[PDB]
């Protein structure tokens, strides 16, 4: 069943997630959605409190991921529940307990007696027509040989006990649905009609009557009840007989159409006769209220609290393991919980946030206008989970069974899924402070890595944590900057004291890019791409301050003079970002690299890093410069011209022509890969008449 559920929920995911679903097939009836939610939660809890079996845990995780993907993250948890669920019917012993509903306590109201009598007359009439069609004729004595029956008299001349035989099924059929609560009323139409008021019986050819579609469902349930009743007293006959299992004892669902035919027919005939009398039947329950605005009932909400506190005791268990590391016994009952964590929680996070990338980013902003609204406090707790995962992965590489790569993967895609709604309008102060304590702690962690690498260059714990830093932390923060840049959330997400932390991280990365070692060689890509992010598409103007004093967003201008002089705020841009060279310096450096063209053997990291930088701040401001809007000039953070990209791109592809001669490059392919976005943003018909060398140098 695990594999069956996985395959079904992977193949038919659109049927559940998309409001339209499959065009031909349709969409769920919300009952399938309730069943899927119950299955997901049951499997998740059972796996949580289940002992680790490798095969079972490797088959259960795909099922959970598929069910989570199929379930809409904005799913509506109905307060309405099901009618007396038949869980005990499919019990382990016997496989079928046919318990019916009890109707002894309930009593039928009096006004229904006219309906009861009329339907009894109708049943007697069809009875007579059937067997004077078979050939039975009224006689005074009951003889089987001559097929004559004294009971062939009209309903009025029938004896009282003869009327009761029709009445009994009628009143039980009414009481089973009255005790179920279904409201039966009768209109002013029937009331007017009731006021209006050998026999030849002529019953209504009721076959032409048809029911409403809800009425078909109601007839189905009441037929299932009738079959449960029959199976119940049949089963009692079976234990009285001590065997002889009836082939039709199988449940209603297992029954076939031919077997269901008579029971259904009884359902339709009784309901259609009720309609033809004009009695109005309806559902037994009043809809009380639907609490749509409530985030509590959100599936993503429930999933996130589950994930949130699971990571919570995971982190405090890791604290307990750190405290017991002073001891001798590392074996604990929590091995089950940590394998559960590393094998389910992280992969489930990854698959869920891959499948629902759009949901948590845009709360029905414009993609998928049908829905996809992610709640705002759901957004802030997504950010809180981001922070807490970042803190948990801090200094636990040995405890992780080489799954730290998976943790970094989940963490960076979650960073991509991060969105800034909460920070713009409303965000919990504790969550804000916690996650940006995460940011600054990453800052001084990278710092203490640089000082310990400068104190002792030899490369244990400090070495593995330096590898952790250069593998996770810098690519992580760079992907953070990437998604903020692509979403244009920078200039308003990174307003206050965050820009101080960003100058700190910036200076740290800058000393990293000026320093060289084997770890720096390993992190060449991370350094290049983060500094990239920085220096042609990045939110702040860290190079050009000369026009930043006029920027309204500018840090010093946003926070006046009082607190700036008071706090650890260095009172000058060059003071807060000292080791950073200016634009004049960092672009005369680019031009001198151009006419120089150093061999890759002497000064490699410069031409391996220096171009993508220019690629992700420089064109933040190629769109943002005056070349796009003559108004709002001198309000801009910096001034940067399409001719400036023309010069710098001429520079870069000329030094690429110089590049192709030095061992043909995996890293000049670094710059090429990161430059297709740059040159694609570049206005193409500049690229024509300037691309002439690149095709002969490229087919070389």
């Amino acid at each position: 069943p695990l594999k069956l559920l996985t395959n079904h929920y992977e193949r038919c995911w659109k049927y559940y997630c998309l409001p339209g679903g499959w065009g031909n097939f349709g969409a769920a009836s919300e009952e399938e959605l309730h069943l899927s939610r119950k299955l997901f939660w049951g499997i998740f809890d059972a796996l949580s409190q289940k002992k680790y079996e490798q095969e079972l845990f490797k088959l259960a995780l795909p099922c959970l991921s598929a069910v989570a993907g199929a379930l809409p993250p904005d799913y509506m948890e109905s307060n309405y529940v099901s009618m007396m669920e038949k869980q005990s019917s499919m019990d382990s012993e016997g496989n079928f307990n046919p318990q019916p509903v009890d109707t002894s306590n309930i009593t039928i109201p009096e006004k229904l007696e006219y309906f009861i009598n009329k339907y009894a007359e109708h049943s007697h009439d069809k009875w007579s027509m059937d067997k004077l069609a078979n050939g039975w004729i009224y006689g005074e004595i009951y003889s089987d040989s001559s097929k004559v029956q004294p009971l062939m008299k009209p309903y009025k001349l029938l004896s009282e006990k003869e009327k009761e035989i029709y009445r009994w099924p009628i009143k039980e059929s009414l009481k089973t649905m009255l005790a179920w609560g279904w409201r039966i009323e009768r209109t002013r139409e029937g009331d007017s009609m009731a006021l209006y008021n050998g026999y030849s019986p002529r019953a209504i050819d009721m076959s032409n009557v048809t029911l409403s579609r809800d009425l078909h469902a109601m007839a189905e349930m009441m037929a299932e009840n009738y079959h449960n009743i029959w199976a119940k007293k049949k089963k009692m006959e079976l234990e009285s007989k001590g065997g002889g299992n009836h082939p039709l004892l199988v449940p209603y669902d297992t029954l076939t159409a031919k077997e269901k035919a008579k029971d259904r027919e009884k359902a339709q005939d009784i309901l259609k006769f009720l309609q033809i009398n004009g009695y109005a039947v309806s559902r037994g329950f009043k809809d009380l209220e639907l609490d749509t605005p409530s985030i509590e009932k959100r599936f993503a909400y429930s999933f996130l609290q589950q994930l949130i506190r699971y990571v919570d005791e995971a982190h405090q268990y890791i604290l307990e393991f750190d405290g017991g590391s002073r001891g001798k016994g590392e074996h604990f009952p929590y091995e089950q919980e940590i394998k559960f964590f590393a094998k389910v929680v992280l992969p489930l996070i990854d698959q869920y946030f891959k499948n629902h990338r759009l949901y948590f980013l845009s709360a029905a902003s414009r993609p998928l206008c049908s829905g996809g609204h992610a709640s705002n406090k759901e957004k802030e707790m997504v950010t809180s989970l981001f922070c807490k995962l970042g803190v948990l992965v801090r200094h636990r590489i040995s405890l992780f069974g080489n799954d730290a790569t998976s943790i970094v993967n989940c963490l960076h895609i979650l960073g991509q899924t991060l969105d800034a709604r909460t920070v713009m309008k409303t965000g919990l102060e504790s969550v804000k402070s916690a996650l940006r304590a995460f940011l600054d702690n990453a800052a001084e962690d990278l710092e203490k890595t640089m000082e310990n690498l400068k104190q002792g260059q030899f490369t244990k714990g400090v070495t593995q944590i330096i590898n952790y830093t250069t593998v996770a932390l810098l690519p992580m923060l760079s992907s953070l900057f990437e998604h903020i840049g692509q979403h244009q959330f920078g200039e308003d997400l990174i307003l206050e004291d965050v820009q101080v932390s960003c100058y700190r991280i910036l200076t740290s990365l800058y000393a990293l890019g000026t320093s060289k070692s084997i770890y720096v060689e390993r992190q060449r890509s991370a350094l290049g791409e983060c500094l990239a992010a920085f220096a042609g598409a990045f939110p702040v103007a860290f190079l050009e301050t000369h026009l930043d004093k006029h920027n309204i967003y500018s840090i010093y201008n946003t926070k006046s003079s009082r607190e700036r002089a008071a706090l650890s705020l260095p009172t000058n841009v060059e003071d807060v970002c000292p080791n950073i060279p200016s634009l004049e310096k960092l672009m005369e450096e680019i031009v001198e690299l151009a006419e120089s063209g150093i061999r890759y053997t002497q000064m490699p990291h410069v031409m391996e890093v220096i171009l993508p930088m220019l690629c992700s701040y420089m064109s933040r401001w190629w769109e943002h410069g005056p070349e796009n809007n003559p108004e709002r000039a001198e309000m801009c953070c910096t001034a940067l011209n399409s001719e400036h990209m023309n010069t710098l791109l001429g520079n870069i592809l000329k030094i690429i022509y110089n590049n192709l001669g030095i061992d043909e490059g995996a890293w000049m392919k670094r710059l090429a890969v990161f430059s297709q976005p740059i040159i694609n943003k570049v206005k193409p018909q500049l690229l024509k008449t300037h691309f002439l060398p690149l095709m002969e140098k490229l087919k070389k």
Binding site: S525, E664, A666, K669, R670, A672, V673
Partner: protein, 143 residues
């Protein structure tokens, strides 16, 4: 004696011939692989093949029986040599780094019909280093 990773490598190889996943390779199940590789084995030959390896005599090879014959073959370092050999024949460019440009030739070489733009999109995660060109280092991690 065999490395646990080499056990896992023999796991996936064992399941490669065991499509139905029951842990037993029947003569016909083995025969499908041989015909897929172009060779036409007689039914009698296939029985002779499995019988030599089937110590139990059930007629279908189990994994413990599969390991014993694995040990009987001196495949001590041939696995990565084949992986290295795959890397060089895959790099028809001969640069020591396989480029997405040659990826369009090799997709036709195997016969796979996976679309090329997705192949480049997968090669952006296959290249965790990112080179835009797969080396032996990025080859082994992929394998």
């Amino acid at each position: 004696q065999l490395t646990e990773e080499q056990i896992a490598e023999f796991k996936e190889a064992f399941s490669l011939f065991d499509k139905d996943g029951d842990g037993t390779i029947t003569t016909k199940e083995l025969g499908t692989v041989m015909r897929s590789l172009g060779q036409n084995p007689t039914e009698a030959e296939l029985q002779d093949m499995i019988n030599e390896v089937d110590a139990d005599g059930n007629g279908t090879i189990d994994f413990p029986e599969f390991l014993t014959m694995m040990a009987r073959k001196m495949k001590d370092t041939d696995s990565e040599e084949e992986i290295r050999e795959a890397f060089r024949v895959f790099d028809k460019d001969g640069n020591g780094y396989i480029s997405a440009a040659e990826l369009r030739h090799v997709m036709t070489n195997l016969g796979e019909k996976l679309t090329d733009e997705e192949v480049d999109e997968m090669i952006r995660e296959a290249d965790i280093d990112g080179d835009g060109q797969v080396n032996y280092e990025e080859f082994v991690q992929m394998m």
